[PDB]
Each structure stands twice: as structure tokens, then as C-alpha cells.
Design an enzyme around this catalytic site. Structure first.
Site, PDB file in Angstrom:
ATOM      1  N   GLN A  14       0.800  -1.460   0.046  1.00 31.30           N
ATOM      2  CA  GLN A  14       0.337  -0.118   0.068  1.00 31.30           C
ATOM      3  C   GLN A  14       0.739   1.457   0.022  1.00 31.30           C
ATOM      4  O   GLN A  14       0.256   2.383  -0.044  1.00 31.30           O
ATOM      5  CB  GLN A  14      -1.106  -0.001   1.068  1.00 31.30           C
ATOM      6  CG  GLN A  14      -0.411  -0.262   2.516  1.00 31.30           C
ATOM      7  CD  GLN A  14      -1.455  -0.502   3.800  1.00 31.30           C
ATOM      8  OE1 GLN A  14      -2.023  -1.372   3.654  1.00 31.30           O
ATOM      9  NE2 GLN A  14      -1.755   0.587   4.478  1.00 31.30           N
TER      10      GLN A  14
ATOM     11  N   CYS B 176      -5.259  -0.062   4.200  1.00 30.50           N
ATOM     12  CA  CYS B 176      -5.186  -1.588   4.338  1.00 30.50           C
ATOM     13  C   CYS B 176      -6.785  -2.256   4.267  1.00 30.50           C
ATOM     14  O   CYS B 176      -7.152  -3.294   4.094  1.00 30.50           O
ATOM     15  CB  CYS B 176      -4.866  -1.908   5.530  1.00 30.50           C
ATOM     16  SG  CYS B 176      -5.546  -1.046   7.025  1.00 30.50           S
TER      17      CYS B 176
ATOM     18  N   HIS C 144      -5.930  -2.822  11.919  1.00 31.31           N
ATOM     19  CA  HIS C 144      -5.370  -3.101  10.568  1.00 31.31           C
ATOM     20  C   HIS C 144      -6.542  -4.080  10.033  1.00 31.31           C
ATOM     21  O   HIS C 144      -7.161  -5.025  10.734  1.00 31.31           O
ATOM     22  CB  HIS C 144      -4.065  -3.813  10.853  1.00 31.31           C
ATOM     23  CG  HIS C 144      -3.407  -4.362   9.553  1.00 31.31           C
ATOM     24  ND1 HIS C 144      -3.053  -3.339   8.514  1.00 31.31           N
ATOM     25  CD2 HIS C 144      -2.676  -5.381   9.119  1.00 31.31           C
ATOM     26  CE1 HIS C 144      -2.483  -3.953   7.454  1.00 31.31           C
ATOM     27  NE2 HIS C 144      -2.239  -5.035   7.981  1.00 31.31           N
TER      28      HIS C 144
ATOM     29  N   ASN D   5      -0.933 -10.040   4.237  1.00 33.57           N
ATOM     30  CA  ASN D   5      -0.802  -8.622   4.332  1.00 33.57           C
ATOM     31  C   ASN D   5      -0.571  -7.858   2.970  1.00 33.57           C
ATOM     32  O   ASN D   5      -0.360  -8.309   2.207  1.00 33.57           O
ATOM     33  CB  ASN D   5       0.039  -8.453   5.289  1.00 33.57           C
ATOM     34  CG  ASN D   5       0.333  -7.014   6.104  1.00 33.57           C
ATOM     35  OD1 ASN D   5      -0.553  -6.502   6.167  1.00 33.57           O
ATOM     36  ND2 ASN D   5       1.297  -6.929   6.511  1.00 33.57           N
TER      37      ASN D   5
HETATM   38  C1  LIG Z   1      -4.577   0.482   7.609  1.00 32.30           C
HETATM   39  O1  LIG Z   1      -3.729   0.908   6.624  1.00 32.30           O
HETATM   40  C2  LIG Z   1      -3.696  -0.364   8.514  1.00 32.30           C
HETATM   41  N1  LIG Z   1      -2.508   0.444   9.177  1.00 32.30           N
HETATM   42  C3  LIG Z   1      -1.410   0.344   8.573  1.00 32.30           C
HETATM   43  O2  LIG Z   1      -1.255  -0.630   7.787  1.00 32.30           O
HETATM   44  C4  LIG Z   1      -0.466   1.443   8.519  1.00 32.30           C
HETATM   45  C5  LIG Z   1       0.865   1.269   7.341  1.00 32.30           C
HETATM   46  C6  LIG Z   1       0.883   1.828   6.285  1.00 32.30           C
HETATM   47  C7  LIG Z   1       1.933   1.719   5.249  1.00 32.30           C
HETATM   48  C8  LIG Z   1       2.879   0.844   5.541  1.00 32.30           C
HETATM   49  C9  LIG Z   1       3.104   0.045   6.849  1.00 32.30           C
HETATM   50  C10 LIG Z   1       3.895  -0.909   7.192  1.00 32.30           C
HETATM   51  C11 LIG Z   1       4.229  -1.488   8.391  1.00 32.30           C
HETATM   52  C12 LIG Z   1       5.218  -2.513   8.651  1.00 32.30           C
HETATM   53  C13 LIG Z   1       6.198  -2.916   7.626  1.00 32.30           C
HETATM   54  C14 LIG Z   1       6.058  -2.304   6.300  1.00 32.30           C
HETATM   55  N2  LIG Z   1       5.039  -1.346   6.049  1.00 32.30           N
HETATM   56  C15 LIG Z   1       2.016   0.383   7.726  1.00 32.30           C
HETATM   57  C16 LIG Z   1      -2.774   1.607  10.163  1.00 32.30           C
HETATM   58  C17 LIG Z   1      -4.180   2.654   9.986  1.00 32.30           C
HETATM   59  C18 LIG Z   1      -4.686   2.826   8.652  1.00 32.30           C
HETATM   60  C19 LIG Z   1      -5.579   1.719   7.943  1.00 32.30           C
HETATM   61  N3  LIG Z   1      -6.419   1.133   9.208  1.00 32.30           N
HETATM   62  C20 LIG Z   1      -7.756   1.306   9.016  1.00 32.30           C
HETATM   63  O3  LIG Z   1      -8.119   1.852   7.866  1.00 32.30           O
HETATM   64  C21 LIG Z   1      -8.829   0.837  10.184  1.00 32.30           C
HETATM   65  C22 LIG Z   1      -9.244  -0.396   9.902  1.00 32.30           C
HETATM   66  C23 LIG Z   1     -10.288  -1.229  10.799  1.00 32.30           C
HETATM   67  C24 LIG Z   1      -9.827  -1.355  12.396  1.00 32.30           C
HETATM   68  C25 LIG Z   1     -10.689  -2.603  10.086  1.00 32.30           C
HETATM   69  N4  LIG Z   1      -9.807   1.784   9.954  1.00 32.30           N
HETATM   70  C26 LIG Z   1      -9.660   3.280  10.270  1.00 32.30           C
HETATM   71  O4  LIG Z   1      -8.522   3.672  10.597  1.00 32.30           O
HETATM   72  C27 LIG Z   1     -10.982   4.213   9.842  1.00 32.30           C
HETATM   73  C28 LIG Z   1     -12.267   3.963   9.394  1.00 32.30           C
HETATM   74  C29 LIG Z   1     -12.966   5.271   9.241  1.00 32.30           C
HETATM   75  C30 LIG Z   1     -11.949   6.180   9.711  1.00 32.30           C
HETATM   76  C31 LIG Z   1     -12.387   7.489   9.709  1.00 32.30           C
HETATM   77  C32 LIG Z   1     -13.732   7.784   9.016  1.00 32.30           C
HETATM   78  C33 LIG Z   1     -14.762   6.797   8.797  1.00 32.30           C
HETATM   79  O5  LIG Z   1     -16.068   7.123   8.553  1.00 32.30           O
HETATM   80  C34 LIG Z   1     -16.574   8.050   7.534  1.00 32.30           C
HETATM   81  C35 LIG Z   1     -18.188   7.959   7.489  1.00 32.30           C
HETATM   82  N5  LIG Z   1     -18.931   8.863   6.813  1.00 32.30           N
HETATM   83  C36 LIG Z   1     -18.168   9.248   5.482  1.00 32.30           C
HETATM   84  C37 LIG Z   1     -18.962  10.335   4.635  1.00 32.30           C
HETATM   85  O6  LIG Z   1     -20.100   9.569   4.047  1.00 32.30           O
HETATM   86  C38 LIG Z   1     -21.015   8.806   5.228  1.00 32.30           C
HETATM   87  C39 LIG Z   1     -20.063   7.909   6.256  1.00 32.30           C
HETATM   88  C40 LIG Z   1     -14.203   5.346   9.023  1.00 32.30           C
HETATM   89  O7  LIG Z   1     -10.824   5.587   9.952  1.00 32.30           O
END
Ligand SMILES: *[C@]1(=O)[C]N(C(=O)[C]C2=[C][C]=[C]C(C3=[C][C]=[C][C]=N3)=[C]2)[C][C][C][C]1[N]C(=O)[C]([C][C]([C])[C])[N]C(=O)C1=[C]C2=C([C]=[C]C(O[C][C]N3[C][C]O[C][C]3)=[C]2)O1
Length: 215
Positions: free
Chosen positions: A19, A25, A162, A182
Site C-alpha cells: 500500500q 489496508c 489493521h 498482508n
Molecule cells: C490500515 O492501513 C492499517 N494501518 C497500516 O497498515 C499503516 C501502514 C501504512 C504503510 C506501511 C506500513 C508498514 C508496516 C510494517 C512494515 C511495512 N509497512 C503500515 C494503520 C492505520 C490505517 C489503516 N487502518 C484502517 O483503515 C482501520 C481498519 C479497521 C480497524 C478494520 N480503519 C480506520 O482507520 C478508519 C475507518 C474510518 C475512519 C475515519 C472515518 C470513517 O467514517 C466515515 C463515515 N462517513 C463519511 C462520509 O459518508 C458517510 C459516512 C471510517 O478511519
């Protein structure tokens, strides 16, 4: 037939993706769940566009992150999702540029795994193929994983952060596990994958937000 299965052998999973500098993710977890159903419903293995979901699923937050259901639901009301080739990955939220001519799949909803039921998630993965799961991957023992069946008693089932992809399940050294795919590149974990403790009390809350798309 030993009760364990690796859909990678069945042909249901595409190469591991990276990514880049983006919190997408959720977009890859979804795609790979669809990629899997598409191959089941039509025998073809294709790379679906996660950029598609990053740029157009407004229920989510682009690279800021998001959930899989809201993703499957978008594909539904959108009557389709482009393929990687039609909607390439750039690793950065842009304007929605969905192309119907690129449509490579669709779905009529999705189903959630009952919360915290590893039995359910086991059946699903068995009868449907790759399932989308959410976990706690904030620990450093995760980020630096490389072999064997993972498990850190400091994982927090209530701290999901994640989105990864269940693609099977088995037993290593007598240790039940979950073959997880992953999206951090092929040089991460073990060729991009990671075995995660199974039946060890829903470790890292593997079956706490599990889901797959209906095609
Ligand atoms: C995922 O990407 C997981 N994460 C990472 O992987 C970080 C990462 C990035 C690049 C590289 C590496 C890495 C690590 C080790 C070795 C090599 N490379 C790591 C961490 C955070 C980011 C992301 N997580 C998520 O997306 C979660 C997942 C969930 C638990 C399943 N979700 C959220 O963060 C999330 C969901 C959301 C939100 C904000 C708002 C939301 O609602 C909008 C509602 N609305 C909008 C308008 O229309 C009506 C509805 C939902 O954040």
C-alpha cells in the site's frame, strides 16, 4: 483431507501488494475478498482496484483509513468495481475516476461473521474462500514477524487498527493457525504472509470484525 486449507493453492489469491505511504489496508482487505469470490463465481483470477475504493468510497477516509463493509456496500450500489489495470494504484487519495467500461466485478451485499466466533470464521473461510478480517497490529512483535505461529499476550482485541485477509487455516508445530495475507509488500513477514494464533481466545481479535462479499 486434513482439516486445513490454503486458498493460495486453489488459485483464489493474487500476488501480495504494497500500500505504500497510505492507510489503505481496508481497501486491499476488501479487494482480495472480492478477488476471491470472483474467481469462485467465474474461475478467473484478476487484480481488482483498491485505488477505486480509496478514491470513491466516501463512507471511508481514503488513506486516512476505513472499513470493509462500507467498501463492499459501495461496490453494490455502484454496480461494479474496476480492475487494477483500469484503475491503477498510486498510493494517494485522488478524485473518483471510476470507469464502467473497466468494471471487473460486483456484489449483492456482504455477510458479517458473528463477533468473536472463531468457529464461524473457520466455517466461512472453508465454505466461501478468503474472508476479510480486522486486527490489532500496532505491536512491534507483529511489525517484525517472520516465521511460525504469531501470538503476543499484549494484543488488544478491542484495539483493531489493521485490515488483513484470511486465506486459510492450519496447524504448524501442533499450533492451530490462520494463514493471513498482508498488504505491506512481499518483503514483510514471510513473503508477505503471516500465520496468526488460532483458537487462542480470539487473539488480536481476529474474528471480531470478520466479513466477506456476496457475488
Ligand atoms: C490500515 O492501513 C492499517 N494501518 C497500516 O497498515 C499503516 C501502514 C501504512 C504503510 C506501511 C506500513 C508498514 C508496516 C510494517 C512494515 C511495512 N509497512 C503500515 C494503520 C492505520 C490505517 C489503516 N487502518 C484502517 O483503515 C482501520 C481498519 C479497521 C480497524 C478494520 N480503519 C480506520 O482507520 C478508519 C475507518 C474510518 C475512519 C475515519 C472515518 C470513517 O467514517 C466515515 C463515515 N462517513 C463519511 C462520509 O459518508 C458517510 C459516512 C471510517 O478511519
Amino acid at each position: 483431507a486434513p482439516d486445513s486449507v490454503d486458498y493460495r493453492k486453489k488459485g483464489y489469491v493474487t500476488p501480495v501488494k504494497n500500500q505504500g505511504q497510505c492507510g489503505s489496508c481496508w481497501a486491499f482487505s476488501s479487494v482480495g475478498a472480492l478477488e476471491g469470490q470472483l474467481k469462485k463465481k467465474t474461475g478467473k483470477l484478476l487484480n481488482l482496484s483498491p485505488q477505486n475504493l480509496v478514491d470513491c468510497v466516501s463512507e471511508n477516509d481514503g488513506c486516512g483509513g476505513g472499513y470493509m463493509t462500507n467498501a463492499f456496500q459501495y461496490v453494490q450500489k455502484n454496480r461494479g468495481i474496476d480492475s487494477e489495470d483500469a484503475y491503477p494504484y498510486v498510493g494517494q487519495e485522488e478524485s473518483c475516476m471510476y470507469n464502467p467500461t473497466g468494471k471487473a466485478a460486483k456484489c449483492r451485499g456482504y455477510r458479517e461473521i458473528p463477533e468473536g466466533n472463531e468457529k464461524a470464521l473457520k466455517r466461512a473461510v472453508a465454505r466461501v474462500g478468503p474472508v476479510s478480517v480486522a486486527i490489532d497490529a500496532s505491536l512491534t512483535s507483529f511489525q517484525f514477524y517472520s516465521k511460525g505461529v504469531y501470538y503476543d499476550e499484549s494484543c488488544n482485541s478491542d484495539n483493531l487498527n489493521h485490515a488483513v485477509l484470511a486465506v486459510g487455516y492450519g496447524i504448524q508445530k501442533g499450533n492451530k493457525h490462520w494463514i493471513i495475507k498482508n498488504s505491506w509488500g512481499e518483503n514483510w513477514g514471510n513473503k508477505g504472509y503471516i500465520l496468526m494464533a488460532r483458537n487462542k481466545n480470539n487473539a488480536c481479535g481476529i474474528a471480531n470484525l470478520a466479513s466477506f462479499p456476496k457475488m
